[PDB]
Design a protein around this ligand. Structure first.
Ligand SMILES: Nc1nc2c(ncn2[C@@H]2O[C@H](COP(=O)(O)OP(=O)(O)OP(=O)(O)O)[C@@H](O)[C@H]2O)c(=O)[nH]1
Ligand SMILES: Nc1nc2c(ncn2[C@@H]2O[C@H](COP(=O)(O)OP(=O)(O)O)[C@@H](O)[C@H]2O)c(=O)[nH]1
Ligand SMILES: Cc1cc2nc(/C=C/c3cccnc3)sc2cc1C
Ligand SMILES: [Ca+2]
Ligand SMILES: [Ca+2]
Ligand SMILES: [Mg+2]
Ligand SMILES: [Mg+2]
Lengths: 54, 422, 296, 437
């Protein structure tokens, strides 16, 4: 049971005790994702208005 | 600010709508003249949901009154809270609909519908953030049924991204005006399936049974029937009108209650239906009892998709939570296992008038198919002989439209049976 | 009205337990996938312990101890005994065993130099075993019943409740051999009453003294050892489990531990009595309604 | 000195944000008006508390925080609350209507319209940083905003601040304090999109906080106020190293270094003790050994699971109050000989211990009693995967019937994102099992 790296300060202190040793998408791609979804809403809304128009 | 626009159409729609406004105006402390005289700031904290603030600190309902004859709306204007409604929001014709869906939807109603939409637009434009629309009507008549669904169709075109909910009164031979009610109802249901987010199915047969069997009223009037509807509507809208743990608009409430777009027809319930106050176990027991259901459908004949329960009054929230967890764990076979925790409960500190505490039930059960089956039987019984069809073809309708409406409701029924055996 | 589910149809024991619960009229059986349950008669393989104790307003109980497989596996039992300071190599009542695929191939051959062993998961030659799991020391001199000159083993059923009380069922059974032992009763099942009378007449001793004391010692030793690893004392759910301990006895009346079964079967005429006891102290103790065990 | 910016998203994030900043002010001796009599470096200085607080020429200590919600009713309570003078109006961002518990709504529909505004306000705080560490993000899993908008924000933060670390404080959905049903969807969806953007995430199951409040505080029906004040304590224990002088977890980087050896497995379990009722008159003060032993009691964990049936990859002990190193090590040696603490073979079986001499601060009039010593354990256990198992099971039950899916598709989201997110979670559970058993 070894105690290592004992650092002391006015606010407190810290150390490590060992018991045993071991044996992104770009800005463009995000904009493509968001606008693809916005377009799918517009399409589904258009099919609604088309249905109502009939 | 989460404003709700209220619309009421036809005889039934306006008489029920008036009672609703009569009740919630009392709860919020608004007198018939529109002046506030309550005793708590909690009555005004969410007053903007159903009321517009006038010039002289008055509160005018965000309500629009529609009919094809002036008879019923003259009665409203001459009623107790008749003067509280905005005069311009009285939109009426003279011809009437003659209990005919075609007249309400295609001929007579079409001549009046734009006039209503102008009032709707006027009310909507003055909303900080429109929450959604609310319609009270019957499905067995002509105006509320035919023009009501026509209005809904129009509103969805002008407001495609807004919630559209209805409080719909289902016809029944036990409480009937004309024989063509199943015709009008079938035609209306098809519209509601596609163009509403939530429809509270209020069965007049159920209302009659409750007044007769439970309330011990030998000869129930429409007034007695509307008393139950008024109390239920107050309970359903309680969490929206008062501060509480529940911070949700119509959309969020719709999201948690409707797993499938077409299957959005709810069974309302209320408890109690007396000086001796009820206990929380008693409230919960009655709330799930068929005798307190208003859709005239036996919940044991189906399964609950989702359930909402609203408790009003000062009570042990722990005891409420325990009692709700009691009913579910004693009847788990009636709740679908493929929707975890489908029973949600909200409490409100402010009770309704006359009761120290109450409970309102909102059930999305597959047993609601019994109502549509019942309507479908009555429909087919006449339609196989093309009986009384001349009333409709005389307004320009074809037999095919009837066949299509009949087929869409049978599809709805089959869809409900699909998830009952899941 | 309590609720329970059955997720192990092959369970011989809990098929009777579930039947007794229904006969009380205070227990309703649910669908196997219904989460709103009080009691769970779970499956043997991959029991979803992680989904237990997360139902508001429902005290949940399960008929299996999570992590008890460390005691009910061949390779795990050996590892548990050699590594635990409360057992260690000086175990006395457990045969010298070795784990081979850690592994202990070089250690086994060292002790190899009466030298007959048995591998499982019997030969005097070490090469015949490795070419064929754990290798255990085969008891070359077992106790034999007379008349018959036959080998036998003793099965004891042990119930451990949610409070980790250890209950030993009074009725055990002997799975005897029909053929005479060669080192070159109804259905072979003898119960305690007869076996006790035999010991008194033949060896002038009792079942309690010569054997049962050592048995109670071993059972209590194994379970109290693995207790801090499997205990559900402060868990969000509770566990109980029936165990099947298998024993051997030599000519010197010494008791040896063979294996431990997590899902054991019971004797025919003992089903009615044992299963009833399970309901009383392991189920009704948690879910009260409207002794055959020896507490260790 | 290096600064840390906190971001509070959705109702859960904002209200918990309020609880923490309230607690921070009490700890650092900052008055509600922003003044701080302790700070002698007026209008500047680079002390440890300056990591979370900026300073004006007037002497006001302003939190480096941003509050964002898609509806104003919750944040408006901050604008007129006790600490209204603490925040700048630009730090408080609100929208018209919320995401209605719909991930797709918060991420795609509404989030798109407000994402640029939020980033710009964050940029305002970033420009006042000499050397920004990274971000601390508070949000729920179940909410449409908390899940939907957060994942979108986390994506953009990696684009605009690639060198900066991002820590999460996430609220795991519990049915007992929720009225929503689609939370398993939102939880899985936001975890899948945020996973490769969060360096370290602390999950807090409301079920755990609920029972701790019921059991240890004698509260029958715990409110959000109850839950948040307790959550704030745990959060305070975790961020104390960033706000005080020390050598353990001094920056956001060391959190990943000391707790997260494997990137995807960045969900450390948190355990806290002691939780004592303020209405409890006579109370025997617990020792160092007693509160340390409690760290291995499942009933004190932020997520209910059984670490005994998993493996540890890392473990930190954060003590606050009257605590000496001698008693700590004396407790650790004893605990190992009574507890089943298994580490993975490729990690040292040890403990990184930190002590903050300043005793725990509690909100005056709160439900939590004042204690002389307290400890928060941060352990990376494979046992926390039980929470993923529960969550994914509820997902499977509903998605098999495609229940509620139409709400998400109607907001422009494709159905394929559901299965894509679920497959990621299936892989996540697999990773835990390989490391574990
Ligand atoms: N601990 C804690 N949890 C909360 C709090 N408020 C809400 N939650 C939880 O957060 C989950 C989702 O709700 P919200 O966070 O309010 O949703 P949102 O982020 O506002 O997103 P919207 O759906 O657009 O409103 C629920 O399961 C709640 O249990 C809170 O104050 N404290
Ligand atoms: N509950 C209730 N039902 C009504 C009332 N008035 C009419 N109904 C029902 O509504 C149907 C008649 O529709 P009605 O509203 O009178 O015709 P409309 O004016 O064209 O909409 C019948 O099935 C009646 O049973 C009422 O005041 N209360
Ligand atoms: C879960 C839940 C759902 C819910 N839905 C409600 C509906 C209100 C309403 C009012 C007017 C028009 N349309 C809908 S109240 C309610 C309460 C709970 C707990
Ligand atoms: Ca005309
Ligand atoms: Ca300073
Ligand atoms: Mg009429
Ligand atoms: Mg919100």
């Amino acid at each position: 049971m070894e105690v290592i790296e004992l650092n002391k300060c006015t606010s407190g202190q810290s150390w490590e005790v060992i018991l045993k040793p071991p044996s992104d998408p770009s800005l463009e791609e995000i904009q493509k994702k968001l606008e693809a979804a916005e377009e799918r809403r517009k399409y589904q809304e258009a099919e609604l208005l088309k249905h109502l128009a009939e | 600010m989460r404003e709700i626009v209220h619309i009421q159409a036809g005889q039934c729609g306006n008489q029920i709508g008036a009672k609703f406004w009569e009740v919630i105006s009392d709860e919020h402390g608004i007198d018939p003249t529109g002046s506030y005289h309550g005793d708590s700031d909690l009555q005004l904290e969410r007053i903007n949901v159903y009321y517009n603030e006038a010039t002289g600190n008055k509160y005018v309902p965000r309500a629009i009154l529609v009919d094809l004859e002036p008879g019923t709306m003259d009665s409203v204007r001459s009623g107790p809270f008749g003067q509280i409604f905005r005069p311009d929001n009285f939109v009426f014709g003279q011809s009437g609909a003659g209990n005919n869906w075609a007249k309400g939807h295609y001929t007579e109603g079409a001549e009046l519908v734009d006039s209503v939409l102008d009032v709707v637009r006027k009310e909507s434009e003055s909303c900080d953030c429109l929450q959604g629309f609310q319609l009270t009507h019957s499905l067995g008549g002509g105006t509320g049924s035919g023009m009501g669904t026509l209005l809904i169709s129009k509103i969805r075109e002008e407001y495609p991204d807004r919630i559209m909910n209805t409080f719909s009164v289902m016809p029944s031979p036990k409480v009937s005006d004309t024989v063509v009610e199943p015709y009008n109802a079938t035609l209306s249901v098809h519209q509601l399936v596609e163009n509403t987010d939530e429809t509270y199915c209020i069965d007049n047969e159920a209302l009659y049974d409750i007044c007769f069997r439970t309330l011990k009223l030998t000869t129930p009037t429409y007034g007695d029937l509307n008393h139950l509807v008024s109390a239920t509507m107050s309970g359903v809208t309680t969490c929206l009108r008062f501060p509480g743990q529940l911070n949700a608009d119509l959309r969020k409430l719709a999201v948690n209650m409707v797993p499938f777009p077409r299957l959005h027809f709810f069974m309302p319930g209320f408890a109690p239906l007396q000086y001796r106050a009820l206990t929380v176990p008693e409230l919960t027991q009655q709330m799930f009892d068929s005798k307190n259901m208003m859709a005239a459908c036996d919940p044991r004949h189906g399964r609950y998709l989702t359930v909402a329960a609203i408790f009003r009054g000062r009570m042990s929230m722990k005891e409420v939570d325990e009692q709700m967890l009691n009913v579910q764990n004693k009847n788990s076979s009636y709740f679908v296992e493929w929707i975890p925790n489908n029973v949600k409960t909200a409490v409100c500190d402010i009770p309704p008038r006359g009761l120290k505490m109450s409970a309102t039930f909102i059930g999305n059960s597959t047993a609601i198919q019994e109502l549509f089956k019942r309507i479908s039987e009555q429909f087919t019984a006449m339609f196989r002989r093309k009986a009384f069809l001349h009333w409709y073809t005389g307004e320009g309708m074809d037999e095919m439209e009837f066949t299509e409406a009949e087929s869409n409701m049978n599809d709805l029924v089959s869809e409900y049976q699909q998830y009952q055996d899941a | 009205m309590y609720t329970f589910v059955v997720r192990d149809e092959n369970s011989s024991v809990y098929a009777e337990v579930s039947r007794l619960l229904l006969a009380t009229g205070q227990w309703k059986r649910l669908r196997k996938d219904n989460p709103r349950f009080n009691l769970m008669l779970g499956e043997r393989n991959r029991l979803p312990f992680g989904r237990l104790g997360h139902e508001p307003g429902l005290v949940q109980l399960v008929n299996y101890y999570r992590g008890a497989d460390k005691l009910c596996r061949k390779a795990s039992l050996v590892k548990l005994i050699k590594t635990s300071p409360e057992l260690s190599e000086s175990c006395t009542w457990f045969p010298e065993s070795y784990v081979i695929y850690t592994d202990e191939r070089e250690v086994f051959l060292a002790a190899y130099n009466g030298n007959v062993w048995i591998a499982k998961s019997i030969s005097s030659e070490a090469s015949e075993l490795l070419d064929f799991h754990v290798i255990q020391k085969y008891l070359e001199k077992p106790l034999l019943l007379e008349p018959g000159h036959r080998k036998f083993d003793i099965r004891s059923w042990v119930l451990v409740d949610h409070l980790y009380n250890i209950y030993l069922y009074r009725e055990g059974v002997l799975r005897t051999s029909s053929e005479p032992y060669n080192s070159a009763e109804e259905g072979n099942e003898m119960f305690f009453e007869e076996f006790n009378q035999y010991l008194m007449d033949a060896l002038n001793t009792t079942l309690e003294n010569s054997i049962l004391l050592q048995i109670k010692h071993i059972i209590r030793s194994c379970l109290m050892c693995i207790e801090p690893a499997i205990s559900t004392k402060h868990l969000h759910y509770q566990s109980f489990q029936l165990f099947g301990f298998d024993f051997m006895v030599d000519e010197e009346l010494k008791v040896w531990l063979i294996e431990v079964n997590g899902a054991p079967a019971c004797a025919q005429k003992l089903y009615a009595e044992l299963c009833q006891g399970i309901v009383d102290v392991a189920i009704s103790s948690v879910f009260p309604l409207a002794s055959i065990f020896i507490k260790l | 000195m290096r600064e840390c910016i906190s971001i509070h998203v959705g109702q859960a994030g904002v209200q918990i944000g309020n609880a923490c900043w309230e607690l921070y002010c009490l700890e650092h001796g900052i008055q509600p008006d922003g003044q701080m009599p302790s700070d002698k470096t007026i209008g500047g200085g680079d002390d440890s508390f300056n990591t979370f607080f900026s300073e004006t020429g007037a002497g006001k200590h302003v939190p480096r925080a941003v509050f964002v919600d898609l509806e104003p009713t919750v944040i408006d309570e901050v604008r007129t609350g006790t600490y209204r003078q603490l925040f700048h109006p630009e730090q408080l961002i609100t929208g018209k209507e919320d995401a209605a518990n719909n991930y797709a709504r918060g991420h795609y529909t509404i989030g798109k319209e407000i994402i640029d505004l939020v980033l710009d306000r964050i940029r305002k705080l970033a420009d006042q940083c000499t050397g920004l560490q990274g971000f601390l993000v508070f949000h729920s899993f179940g909410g449409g905003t908390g899940s939907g908008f957060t994942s979108l924000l986390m994506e953009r933060l990696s684009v605009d601040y690639g060198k900066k670390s991002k820590l999460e404080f996430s609220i795991y959905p519990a049915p007992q304090v929720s009225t929503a049903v689609v939370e398993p969807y939102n939880s899985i969806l936001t975890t899948h999109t945020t996973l490769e953007h969060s360096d370290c995430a602390f999950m807090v199951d409301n079920e755990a906080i609920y029972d701790i409040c019921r059991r240890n505080l004698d509260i029958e029906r715990p409110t959000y106020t109850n839950l948040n004040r307790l959550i704030s304590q745990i959060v305070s224990s975790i961020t104390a190293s960033l706000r005080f002088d020390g050598a353990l977890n001094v920056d956001l980087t060391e959190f990943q270094t000391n707790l997260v050896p494997y990137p995807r497995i960045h969900f450390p379990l948190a355990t806290y003790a002691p939780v004592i009722s303020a209405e409890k008159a006579y109370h025997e003060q617990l020792s160092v050994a007693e509160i340390t032993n409690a760290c291995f009691e499942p009933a004190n964990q932020m997520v209910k699971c059984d670490p005994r049936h998993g493996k540890y990859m890392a473990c930190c002990l954060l003590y606050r109050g009257d605590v000496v190193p001698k008693d700590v090590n004396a407790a650790i040696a004893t605990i190992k000989t009574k507890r089943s603490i298994q580490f993975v073979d490729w990690c040292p079986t040890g403990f990184k211990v930190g002590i903050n001499y300043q005793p725990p601060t509690v909100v005056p009039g709160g439900d939590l009693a004042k204690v002389q010593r307290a400890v928060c354990m941060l352990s990376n256990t494979t046992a926390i995967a039980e929470a993923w198992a529960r969550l994914d099971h509820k997902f499977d039950l509903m998605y098999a019937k495609r229940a509620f899916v139409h709400w998400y598709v109607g907001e422009g989201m494709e159905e394929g994102e559901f299965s894509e997110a679920r497959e990621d979670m299936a892989a996540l559970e697999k990773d835990y099992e390989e490391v574990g058993v």
